[PDB]
């Protein structure tokens with residue numbers, strides 16, 4: 001015949017600087033990276049219509065957000081290497097909204113504030129890994145089928161701003177403040193075995209708190225890892241856990257037996273990840289509806305400055321968006337904030353005060369010079385995948401802000417044969433929060449980070465409906481406005497690596513703490529090595545550590561059984577004295593590990609003060625025995 005689509009699945013490492021960079025999400029000057037729990041990945045899904053095609057690519061990333069700077073550079077790189085294949089119309093980048101990665105990868109000052117500015121090494125790793133994930137995906141194209149399903153996930157999330165949610169007049173089906181809908185797009189190969197999947201479900205990826213310093217992809221990242229590493233059987237499975245409208249949704253409390261909820265953020269991350277995984281796996285297993293039909297897409301950069309909004313989307317009067325403002329730790333420090341001005345002096349312009357409505361302005365970000373602290377030109381994008389439409393929206397939408405847009409788009413698209421509309425927030429840029437008009441009036445946290453005023457949600461609804469109508473009628477969307485390039489003029493106040501020295505009387509790679517003679521399943525092995533600063537080399541597609549199996553004995557050929565990516569391992573870096581440092585590596589030995597002999601290897605990099613040369617360093621522990629059974 002035969003198969004309606006081809007798809008390609010790819011994954012690549014986008015982990016940034018693992019020590020001494022402010023983390024992105026919690027806005028803390030006292031949350032710097034200090035190691036890795038699990039790495040961050042870009043997971044790319046290339047889809048081609050056999051009829052056609054007509055190729056689309058969707059990439060979900062283990063990041064707090066995908067900033068405009070990343071989107072622009074990724075597109076340029078794709079156009080340079082693969083001319084005519086990819087552009088803004090057929091590439092969607094989205095983020096899981098983990099709050100446990102290194103920051104500094106926006107070009108807008110607001111989002112770099114707590115990080116003390118732009119961190120080029122982390123930015124570059126993100127861009128490069130997103131591109132590598134697409135390269136890997138497109139090199140693995142195969143014929144297959146696509147299925148769609150949905151279901152209700154009850155106990156994974158909770159509304160964190162319920163007072164505002166309840167101000168909406170239209171909350172039937174959302175009376176608990178939760179959007180319980182999970183949607184799954186499954187990728188079924190010519191065998192039809194499940195080759196990969198994308199799950200969409202809204203919940204903040206904040207199980208690892210602002211007290212944590214280890215890099216982690218958080219609860220959605222655990223869901224992906226559990227599917228790829230613990231569950232599939234097949235290689236190489238790619239499972240993305242993506243967001244929808246999560247602006248006002250937090251992980252539910254973890255009240256599983258024997259746990260306080262509070263007691264252990266790793267347990268919480270695993271539990272909330274597992275709750276999402278279990279539902280995604282259930283839905284995929286149902287293969288509810290085969291996806292059939294054309295691939296299509298639209299994309300527009302929209303200038304938000306004085307954007308007119310038609311009365312059909314507002315209270316019934318014509319409206320216009322406001323320039324950006326935030327409503328009501330630097331301190332202290334913050335030299336980057338100081339280089340920006342920093343906070344004050346208002347009163348802001350009267351026109352701004354007036355049209356921001358119930359907001360009490362804390363910072364007038366839109367009027368900052370030479371550059372606004374927040375974006376002004378924002379991407380709006382939609383993919384059609386058979387009877388599915390997937391929307392990529394550049395912000396955090398509350399449940400009702402997203403639901404209203406979904407409803408409006410489904411109404412506009414029904415005649416085109418669309419039956420399911422999936423709203424993917426955190427896509428292509430990041431412009432803070434979107435609350436409905438009613439929520440905005442309450443001015444809880446999400447209101448007050450709704451930058452463009454009370455009609456921000458109405459603007460997005462208009463933009464998406466107009467795009468849906470263009471798709472329906474065939475026909476282009478309006479010409480894109482011109483996304484500002486701020487690459488020239490990025491500031492940074494985060495110091496780098498001066499140099500590394502080994503511990504006095506030792507060499508890089510020397511073992512500081514050897515493992516015990518023997519351990520049992522369930523025990524944690526902790527070892528430590530003289531190291532150098534992880535800012536020297538991200539060890540992209542490699543590792544800071546290996547757990548190595550050498551057999552029952554002997555004497556057997558070494559086989560790596562765990563890397564720094566794995567849930568069961570941790571890598572921690574800490575400064576010792578002026579220029580020395582230690583790498584502490586742990587392994588929690590999981591059920592099912594073979595009894596036998598093991599050791600731990602460390603890989604790192606060190607910088608010479610005099611030459612500035614960066615070299616490879618490393619070491620291996622003595623062996624230890626895991627005791628048990630089979």
Ligand SMILES: CCCCCCCCCCCCCCCC(=O)O
Nearest residue numbers: 298470471473474475476477478479
């Ligand atoms: C107000 C909207 C109409 C104006 C749009 C400007 C037309 C130029 C766009 C050309 C790019 C091709 C757009 C996709 C068209 C299609 O495939 O249906």
Ligand SMILES: [Mg+2]
Nearest residue numbers: 037564566569
């Ligand atoms: Mg690990």
Ligand SMILES: [Zn+2]
Nearest residue numbers: 097204247396
């Ligand atoms: Zn958020």
